[PDB]
Amino acid sequence: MLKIIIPTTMLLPMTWMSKHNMIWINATVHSLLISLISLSLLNQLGENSLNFSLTFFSDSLSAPLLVLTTWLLPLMLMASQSHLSKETTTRKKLYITMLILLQLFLIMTFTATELILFYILFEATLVPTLIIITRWGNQTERLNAGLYFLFYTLAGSLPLLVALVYIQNTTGSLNFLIIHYWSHPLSNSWSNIFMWLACIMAFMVKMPLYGLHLWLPKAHVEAPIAGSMVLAAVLLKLGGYGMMRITTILNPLTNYMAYPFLMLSMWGMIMTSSICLRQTDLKSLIAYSSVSHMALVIVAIMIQTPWSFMGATALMIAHGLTSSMLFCLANTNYERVHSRTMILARGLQTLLPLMATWWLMASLTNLALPPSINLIGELFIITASFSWSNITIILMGMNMMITALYSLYMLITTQRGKYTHHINNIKASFTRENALMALHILPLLLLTLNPKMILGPLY
């Protein structure tokens, strides 16, 4: 993985010494070649995970997420120099450095072999995101955002650390391959119940589960766009990925304690969706939609069914792409209006036809229009849940319904109407954002064409 790690690390000196004008160009292009190199990592052996070294390995679950992060890295670079144009060169270089360190930590996380190293980099993603959210944020509760986000993450992270070190003392090693091959049945002891809770609740905090999901409507809504997309697209996937890794040594106990959280998500995905309907801000609506989709992924994880795992992975990838695109579109409109209430600027479909389209298939993919990978990922989870329990369907059946409502509602109330007369700053569509939504959208349908890649390790 050092064919991807070493270039990512060496990307830091390039930006840190590039001229006052070349930082954006150089970072964008070289991150694009980094994504190209990581495109190779989609090469997967039939059943054996690709073990590059002792400390680094990859399989059909880590590789798609890694490719997602590496391909994403140019996208924040393209979305940031709009709101980062009027800044000192050193400050811009550090913003870029925060982004590269974030991507590097995500790569080491996804390619980590020992659970402790996975925890180290997984949590270590907090710091660059914290700096991005706090310093470069524009709204008020950004300072409150950082506190909420850090403390919510850590409150689950530390018990996970205690559980992992206890596992190391008892089992012998935290290596994934060992704990899977040398896996042993888990007894229904209450100490084992608390161990399962410690191993689960950190990822479920970052999932998020309903109830303890307040860090997203107070974090993604406030972060700069680059931070917002890197949060929603991948950082949410950290908990799902960790759960998929950890349920190997968390059975057969899970089912007995699967009952509270599963429905907590199942019911929660309704409320969040309902919360999406009666929203006032675009970014908050997208954040709550992300919460609902991630709750569906939670249900997929706790079913522990092959089909559930494949649908889960597909939903993570598709949701990352769709949420990043929706946040980018919201930023474009907000910057054009310097406000975020989704009533101030409506009826812009005529003014910006390409934005009107980009919003149209962004909503369609968010609404999971078949045969997009969003729809197949959702439907696989629906079928797995129905096999696990029939009634789930109606709740599932409710979700996209309400989702569809808001999935079109903002499009009705932001572009499908009459323009506001007193505003005039809406200029011609700068081709930067249009191109950015292109690099968002075309890979989505490309993966729709061949979903065997994002299908996960169960395929």
Binding site: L54, T113, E114, I116, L117, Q168
Partner: protein, 171 residues
């Protein structure tokens, strides 16, 4: 838990030489010269055995020899010794410094009546070698068996198997 063995009153029924401390001090040097063998044997027994309940017979024999010495000095040089020890007894600190003439009379009397000479300065404080015939106490302190020493650490050292073996650090 045990027995505090004590020799019965019959063994320690010595003749109990009875002279005052001044009388003892007056005849100190000559007694040390002409009675060194019993004192030395008894003290070597005391220091070696470290048990006064064992060397009681040497305590008898030293008193016997001391009484013999005093009987001889009574029989041959009674008057000069009496005057010398009285003059020693007058002093509060019992110093030989004030009483030198009587010391001279006593010394010449015992020299020409019992063939004695006073030890020179420091002669009576030299470590002597005794020819006692008792065995050497194998365990004077009655020490029990010592605990076995911890297993000695030995052997060639090779690199630690698989490095530090501390989490993900392979090397």
């Amino acid at each position: 838990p045990g027995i505090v063995e004590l020799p019965t009153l019959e063994d320690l029924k010595v003749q109990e030489v009875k002279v005052s401390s001044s009388v003892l001090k007056a005849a100190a040097h000559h007694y040390g010269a002409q009675c060194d063998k019993p004192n030395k044997e008894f003290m070597l027994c005391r220091w070696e055995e470290k048990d006064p309940r064992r060397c009681l017979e040497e305590g008898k024999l030293v008193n016997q020899c001391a009484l013999d010495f005093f009987r001889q000095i009574k029989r041959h040089c009674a008057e000069p010794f009496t005057e010398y020890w009285t003059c020693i007894d007058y002093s509060g600190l019992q110093l030989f410094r004030h009483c030198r003439k009587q010391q001279a009379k006593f010394d010449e009397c015992v020299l020409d009546k019992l063939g004695w000479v006073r030890p020179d300065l420091g002669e009576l404080s030299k470590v002597t070698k005794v020819k006692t015939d008792r065995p050497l106490p194998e365990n004077p302190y009655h020490s029990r068996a010592r605990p076995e020493p911890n297993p000695e650490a030995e052997g060639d050292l090779k690199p630690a198997k698989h490095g530090s073996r501390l989490f993900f650090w392979t090397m």
